[PDB]
Amino acid sequence: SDRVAQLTIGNSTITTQEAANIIVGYGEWPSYCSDSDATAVDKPTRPDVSVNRFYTLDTKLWEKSSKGWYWKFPDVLTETGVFGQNAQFHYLYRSGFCIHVQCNASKFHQGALLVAVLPEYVIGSVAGGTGTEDTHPPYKQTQPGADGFELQHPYVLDAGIPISQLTVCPHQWINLRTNNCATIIVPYINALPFDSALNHCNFGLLVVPISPLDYDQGATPVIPITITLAPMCSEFAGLRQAVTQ
Amino acid sequence: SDRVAQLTIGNSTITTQEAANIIVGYGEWPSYCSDSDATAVDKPTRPDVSVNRFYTLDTKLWEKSSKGWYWKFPDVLTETGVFGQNAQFHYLYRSGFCIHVQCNASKFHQGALLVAVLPEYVIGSVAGGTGTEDTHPPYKQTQPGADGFELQHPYVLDAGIPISQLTVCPHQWINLRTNNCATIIVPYINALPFDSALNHCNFGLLVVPISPLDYDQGATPVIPITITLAPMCSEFAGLRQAVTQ
Amino acid sequence: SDRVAQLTIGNSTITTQEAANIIVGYGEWPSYCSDSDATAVDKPTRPDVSVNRFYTLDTKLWEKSSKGWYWKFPDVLTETGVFGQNAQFHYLYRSGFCIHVQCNASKFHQGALLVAVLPEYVIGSVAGGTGTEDTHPPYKQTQPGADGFELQHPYVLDAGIPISQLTVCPHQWINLRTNNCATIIVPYINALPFDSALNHCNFGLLVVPISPLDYDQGATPVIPITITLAPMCSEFAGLRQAVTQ
Amino acid sequence: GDRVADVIESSIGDSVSRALTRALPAPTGQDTQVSSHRLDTGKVPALQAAEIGASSNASDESMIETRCVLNSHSTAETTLDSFFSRAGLVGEIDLPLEGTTNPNGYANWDIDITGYAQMRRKVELFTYMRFDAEFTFVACTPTGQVVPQLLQYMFVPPGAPEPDSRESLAWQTATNPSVFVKLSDPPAQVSVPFMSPASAYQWFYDGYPTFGEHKQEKDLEYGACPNNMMGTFSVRTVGTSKSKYPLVIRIYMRMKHVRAWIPRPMRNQNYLFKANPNYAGNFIKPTGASRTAITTL
Amino acid sequence: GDRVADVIESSIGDSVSRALTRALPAPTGQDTQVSSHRLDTGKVPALQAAEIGASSNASDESMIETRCVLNSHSTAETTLDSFFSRAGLVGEIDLPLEGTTNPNGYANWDIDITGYAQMRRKVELFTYMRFDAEFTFVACTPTGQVVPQLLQYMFVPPGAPEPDSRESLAWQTATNPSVFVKLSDPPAQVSVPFMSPASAYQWFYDGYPTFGEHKQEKDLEYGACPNNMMGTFSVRTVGTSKSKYPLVIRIYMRMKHVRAWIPRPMRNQNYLFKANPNYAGNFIKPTGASRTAITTL
Amino acid sequence: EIGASSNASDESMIETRCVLNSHSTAETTLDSFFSRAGLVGEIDLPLEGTTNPNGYANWDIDITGYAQMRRKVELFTYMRFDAEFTFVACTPTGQVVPQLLQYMFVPPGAPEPDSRESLAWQTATNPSVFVKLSDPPAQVSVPFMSPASAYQWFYDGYPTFGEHKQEKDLEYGACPNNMMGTFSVRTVGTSKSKYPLVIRIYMRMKHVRAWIPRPMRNQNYLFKANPNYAGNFIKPTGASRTAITTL
Amino acid sequence: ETILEVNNVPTNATSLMERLRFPVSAQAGKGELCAVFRADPGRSGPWQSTLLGQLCGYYTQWSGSLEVTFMFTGSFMATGKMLIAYTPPGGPLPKDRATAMLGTHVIWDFGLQSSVTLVIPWISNTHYRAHARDGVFDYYTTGLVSIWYQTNYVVPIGAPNTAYIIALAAAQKNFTMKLCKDASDILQTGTIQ
């Protein structure tokens, strides 16, 4: 009975009492991050629990002709909030996460969603769509902002990625039999210890409806899905002034 | 031998080894601030040592015809830096201080300065200078910024304040016999426990040259005086979003 | 408090009581020199303390347009005094040293000198200056005598020696903040055990003003710098008659 | 568990306002006596210089000696904090039968120490204060005699509406008790405790007591707070028997339960409004008169 | 001292990557056997369903029973990680005497696994890797015979300038050792360790390996890093005796010291440049061919 | 230098941080392993030529071969090391031809051959190496036979007895007898080669032991260990800019 | 101890006698900039002029930073008030005292002691970077150091208004430097035969 959460900030909040349980990861111990291998030797700090709390970032709708969506991690909150300014003026970042997506369906509604968190994913961009003519994709698809971006082809994930072979990542189902909300757990993984928040892209989410949305005419056409995230025990290194360069 | 300081941030710093000693205050014990008497009952936090460090705010010159200057506390850093944004978006503030003013004179130079820290001082503004005609002082004397403001009459301090009766506050002398730099110690005092950083003004510094600057022609005409401050163990209450209202 | 010296010979002498301290070398033990590896097997002797005492050799001036000077070691005293005759008629020499250079500046004066002792230094001679035309340097630059010789180019040391990369040798500063006189410590080092005093040159001093001499017009233009040396516990081998060949 | 020790640098032991210095109490103290000239070391605290407390490396009194004085004065009851009140004129008001300054028949005055700066400035030498107060209203004739009329006193607690007529609702003042006094009874004598909204009365205070952005419109609230104050007092004649003589009152002021802080030095200039930092700059005069020479008068 | 306990909430015991969960080791384990049908409780682990591992409140197998199977297979040496290499064509290059593609007489090729995607894509199924490599250069005639000529191999370490002439300074390569080989000796066989600047080779990586703001000008560095790479290899003929026969080389590739991570699934499309996510969208075809019906072929 | 705090505080305003280490320094030494790729040099023995009218080539063995890469090693003065000489033979065109070649060594002190039939070929005290063009190319180790404790390059002296005059000045660097000898190459036997040949000389150093650090040289010589420099065209060790703030 | 001369801007032979200079004059004394210089010591120029820098110029990788200081040569009454400040990479050119405020460093003052020990810790997240070639890839900033005046170059009457000194730097145990590259610049018109 450890599927509880105490959350209250701003003016509203969301907590659960009899939700769809949780998913455990790696069966492991708590720890901080490696400190005695950086370029410099200065002592680290610990920002603690100053600002880490949940604000929803988008309530994505699900419709009859949903084609797929995703996000860029951690580009979602790198530009907004005191966390945004801290990430902008600070070079090194690391923290854990507890992803909680709210996904409810009514008695009338039937269907399921294909929500897959894909780490380390080199993003499959539009790249001109065809890509045979050298017209480079503009910046309006590299830094979309809080809106995310629309993925082109589901069963190849814009990169040749056949759908049935996505099973490697933590796989989740959205069904009124299964869950009133889904939980995703991911720690901090990178092939290199230290990097900037503007050059390197870690990964992003992915959502493609595994089942088409259907309902007899007379019901709600779209289904909103809410997402929020708050990193737990966040620590930032490369402490410096408010200087981008 | 506890007149030491370890300071390094940005690109430059200032520390002393054989300075003009220190001034002790009240012969007291360390402590946090009262917590069980606020309007709300939520638990407090502790920002710790995240950003508290010294950057100089101005290097004030001393000249032949110096008439006097001062500052507004804590209006000096309420608008600039991550401390500035924190103070803007946070309602309650409290911390200790260690004022260190750098004031050197050469072999050629003779003279002294009258630097007095005056707490709780209701500011004696220009108020039209004469004040007999109702032309209210503009905002260009309420929020001067990082430049401070120029005091009108020394021996009345713009409020009727005769000079010889300033002895109540910690009194300091600037002389090559006395000090290569001066130290001032002041804790947090207010007649009320909680207030905003934009409505209420706590106090400010005051500088009026006790002795006129003099030198035989052929030497430097002006004398720079440097000031920096960094609050120790700062704690902010009224934690909220980046919302002014 | 072992920075003392008892010196009295001839008619004048120089000792210090509150000088600029001393520089230690190699953290080592006293010892004589290797005896069981020479060409012959005859027993050695010990001249002891017969004549080792300080006479100044030159009081070098420092001026507005100083370009640099140096000396040849141990050519400075190889030709004068009873030590001179002993070195002339004796083939092998070895002793320790305690270099004490007197360098004072007044209240008016500002500046510094670049005095570097450079062991094993193959001398960078004039060699015709240009050196492209085969006109060999005369003997008036191989055996200058008690006057020393003038070095041509400071920042290459007449051999391509960039200045900032002289740091290898014991480095000293001449400043009224730093020293009223400088101390240099060097033992006897040679790549070969035994050599003559006329064929091989061990090393020499080097002086180039690190800072140009400056003063407001009306003060002394030149600054004298005094140098003396007296080898401690000198021992000479190859004992023979007064025969050069 | 207990593995990292990053936070242990703290200094638990909270006593007083925030600082970082430390001291320690001692059980007992030290004493000193007096002696004469002698060249000795070890124990010689006989004389005391407030700053130095010793002799410099250049002798101060090598030529002559000193003397001694004995004490016969007591300082037990020399404190002034509460007993410093003495004689002095205070002030008066009038309620005539026919007049123009009082077209309504009643007088409502805002209660405050800002009555008359002449003697209030003596008490206004401080800023933060906690004290008890006393109001005395003595009634007589404008000529200076006594007449048997029918008068009574109604109190106006803060927050009540200010009466605009002789028949206002403010006369009921349900939560205000009643005092049984009459002209035959001794004149008014009412105690006033400390009901400041803050810890002390605000005079030397730079702020904005009203919410919202500060503009030129909202500047009059300096000193004259419409609601933060402790109320006013209204005086009239109640009953069918209306007085046939005009009357005058004298108001007497006294302070008890002294507790002060924040020393603020003396003022040698004049104001023009309540707590107005404005001064007669064109006619500034020093706190004392000087002379062409100090040697002779 | 020790008064406040705000920070003591920490969980010292650092073991692995950041998280908040906790577990615990156990000394020994558990076992299970097989049995037949019986209605009993307490101990009944006989059958195992990977997810449920029990029986629902609606019976699954109430009508019939099951059977048993025995094992006779070994799995000790079935691992493929390093031994998965088998036969397959790899590639070749040519150094003719007279030609237009080689107007200089020497061939400098950039060393990488990006040689020929046909078989590299089999190894390119992963992203983060640590392995050893082997390069074999076998020399022969273009016709397929053998001729006694004079050849030798010079290595180009990374960071050295790329030769632009037959007499470049790059031939001295002071820090590069020398291998004593000749056409009589067996063909080239050189080991290549793991000198990646990072922990693994970067192919599926979205970033900017060059400092400064990212613009359209600086986009070609995807895959082809001018300096981050492990160098190239230059081949020519050294000496006064110049060869009178054209020659050809075949390049053989082999991998050792396997250590992999980050599984990445199979690709059914084609690229156009190195690590180019672009695909033939107008002609997308599924990974397998389907049929009009599944029942019959 | 100080290791304490002055009587005027240095860091009274802000605090510092900490850094952790994850790097190893066990095998980072360069003393012997600092050798990498680099072009070294070659020589030629043609059949018909004018630079070699005798048919044999005798070259004085030394590190003074080509200052380009030797100056990298010449950064020191007093040294004890092992050396290796590799002679690889091929055609001037770049091919291989089955000829008959062999290598004769010239120990120091032996007379320098002045003919194809000199007595120096007997070299009684010199052993023989069994090598042929079929065998792998030359690979000969050279130990440290310096007459002194180290090789003399930065040395001001007179290695010849007698009074020093203008006549005896050429011995700077080129010592006729103090050196470790030369090497002579020719073709022995009745079967004379019908192809011209070329050799490449490869250099490598082992058993490093050094002293006496001597800093870097930014100028050029004109003879062996010649302190003379192009004074009329002196240029700093690095290029500067009109301002340091911006490139 | 390694002598470092930063602003040897002049490029003339007659200036090759006085390269020690850094600008001191009748300054405005209002926080105006004296000199700035980026943190990287491994780039060609007067930076590799130092022996530490000369060795770093042959290397590709680097782990850590250096330690620096600067001397002073004023007279007894002569003094000054300068500003020594470092900024880690991530920002444009500094503007004024506020930028120094953003940068953590140690406040410096000319008192009796002349030396000013500025230690730059191991500020390096990555030990190596993606392989590319030279071009417009200057986006990879490395940091900066800024020098400032506060009051003026202050001396009494009768004292010359010039005092210029050279800097000093060295390396600590934390920094490591290897992966040697071959020679890039060496001058030889002829080779020894």
Side-chain angles (χ1 to χ4, degrees), chain C:
Chain C
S1 63
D2 198 73
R3 65 185 184 273
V4 303
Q6 202 283 325
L7 296 174
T8 299
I9 204 62
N11 50 2
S12 183
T13 182
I14 288 299
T15 70
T16 62
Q17 199 268 313
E18 275 294 319
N21 277 311
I22 61 170
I23 297 314
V24 193
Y26 293 99
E28 68 167 81
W29 291 93
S31 88
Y32 64 92
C33 295
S34 175
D35 291 331
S36 306
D37 295 317
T39 80
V41 298
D42 293 76
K43 277 301 179 289
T45 70
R46 224 181 201 190
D48 296 325
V49 298
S50 67
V51 297
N52 293 114
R53 203 50 86 183
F54 292 95
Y55 278 167
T56 186
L57 61 83
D58 186 74
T59 304
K60 195 46 193 58
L61 73 164
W62 179 41
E63 73 271 15
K64 297 296 289 183
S65 299
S66 291
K67 183 173 73 175
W69 292 271
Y70 64 92
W71 302 93
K72 187 179 289 293
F73 194 111
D75 190 76
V76 294
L77 277 296
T78 191
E79 63 276 60
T80 316
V82 69
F83 178 83
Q85 288 91 21
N86 189 359
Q88 193 214 340
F89 311 133
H90 273 166
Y91 278 16
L92 298 179
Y93 64 91
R94 37 194 61 207
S95 175
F97 306 98
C98 205
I99 297 89
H100 296 285
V101 71
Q102 164 163 320
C103 60
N104 68 330
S106 81
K107 276 69 57 186
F108 295 116
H109 295 89
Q110 75 278 15
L113 277 296
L114 189 46
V115 184
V117 75
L118 184 41
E120 61 86 20
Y121 172 61
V122 61
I123 193 66
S125 51
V126 172
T130 50
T132 178
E133 183 65 26
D134 191 7
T135 301
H136 317 71
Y139 285 158
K140 70 181 73 173
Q141 62 86 30
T142 60
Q143 312 304 139
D147 59 357
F149 182 76
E150 165 69 50
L151 57 92
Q152 161 63 261
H153 296 135
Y155 297 178
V156 301
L157 282 72
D158 293 17
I161 292 299
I163 188 163
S164 69
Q165 68 155 47
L166 275 297
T167 69
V168 55
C169 65
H171 183 252
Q172 297 76 16
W173 292 271
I174 289 187
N175 188 359
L176 53 83
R177 283 85 170 93
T178 63
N179 70 310
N180 47 13
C181 50
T183 318
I184 297 89
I185 289 297
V186 62
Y188 194 82
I189 297 89
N190 285 115
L192 53 85
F194 320 105
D195 204 312
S196 80
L198 73 164
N199 188 331
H200 165 86
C201 319
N202 294 257
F203 73 102
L205 183 63
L206 290 172
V207 59
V208 298
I210 192 66
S211 63
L213 188 153
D214 189 358
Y215 66 93
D216 291 338
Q217 174 94 350
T220 49
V222 298
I223 301 299
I225 297 89
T226 314
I227 192 66
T228 187
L229 185 45
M232 301 95 88
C233 185
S234 302
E235 69 275 16
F236 286 175
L239 297 175
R240 284 251 191 171
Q241 316 280 8
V243 177
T244 292
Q245 58 186 350

Side-chain angles (χ1 to χ4, degrees), chain D residues 25-38:
Chain D
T28 48
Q30 199 171 0
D31 67 24
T32 300
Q33 68 169 353
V34 72
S35 164
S36 170
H37 68 88
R38 196 183 82 253

Side-chain angles (χ1 to χ4, degrees), chain B residues 115-178:
Chain B
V115 184
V117 75
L118 184 41
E120 61 86 20
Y121 172 61
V122 61
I123 193 66
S125 51
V126 172
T130 50
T132 178
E133 183 65 26
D134 191 7
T135 301
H136 317 71
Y139 285 158
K140 70 181 73 173
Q141 62 86 30
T142 60
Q143 312 304 139
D147 59 357
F149 182 76
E150 165 69 50
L151 57 92
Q152 161 63 261
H153 296 135
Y155 297 178
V156 301
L157 282 72
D158 293 17
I161 292 299
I163 188 163
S164 69
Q165 68 155 47
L166 275 297
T167 69
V168 55
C169 65
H171 183 252
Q172 297 76 16
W173 292 271
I174 289 187
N175 188 359
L176 53 83
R177 283 85 170 93
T178 63

Side-chain angles (χ1 to χ4, degrees), chain E residues 61-81:
Chain E
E61 202 70 340
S62 80
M63 204 285 268
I64 54 172
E65 291 326 281
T66 56
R67 295 288 257 156
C68 290
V69 176
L70 61 86
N71 74 321
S72 187
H73 194 258
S74 56
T75 61
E77 288 205 41
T78 61
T79 301
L80 62 84
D81 57 358

Side-chain angles (χ1 to χ4, degrees), chain A residues 126-128 133-139 141, chain E residues 215-217 219-220:
Chain A
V126 172
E133 183 65 26
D134 191 6
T135 301
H136 317 71
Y139 285 158
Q141 62 86 30
Chain E
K215 260 88 170 178
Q216 53 293 310
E217 175 194 5
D219 299 336
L220 268 181

Side-chain angles (χ1 to χ4, degrees), chain D residues 32-33 35-36 38-48 53-55:
Chain D
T32 300
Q33 68 169 353
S35 164
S36 170
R38 196 183 82 253
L39 194 146
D40 204 77
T41 57
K43 304 312 152 273
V44 60
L47 284 173
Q48 171 62 211
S55 292

Side-chain angles (χ1 to χ4, degrees), chain B residues 5-9 14-19 53-55, chain F residues 2 4-16:
Chain B
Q6 202 283 325
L7 296 174
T8 299
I9 204 62
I14 288 299
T15 70
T16 62
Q17 199 268 313
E18 275 294 319
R53 203 50 86 183
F54 292 95
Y55 278 167
Chain F
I2 305 173
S5 292
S6 70
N7 51 14
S9 166
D10 45 22
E11 202 70 340
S12 80
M13 204 285 268
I14 54 172
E15 291 326 281
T16 56

Side-chain angles (χ1 to χ4, degrees), chain E residues 150 172-173 175-176 240-243, chain F residues 36-39 91-93 96:
Chain E
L150 288 82
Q172 65 85 30
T173 183
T175 182
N176 199 6
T240 187
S241 48
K242 276 73 69 177
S243 176
Chain F
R36 293 183 183 293
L39 281 74
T91 69
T93 69
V96 292

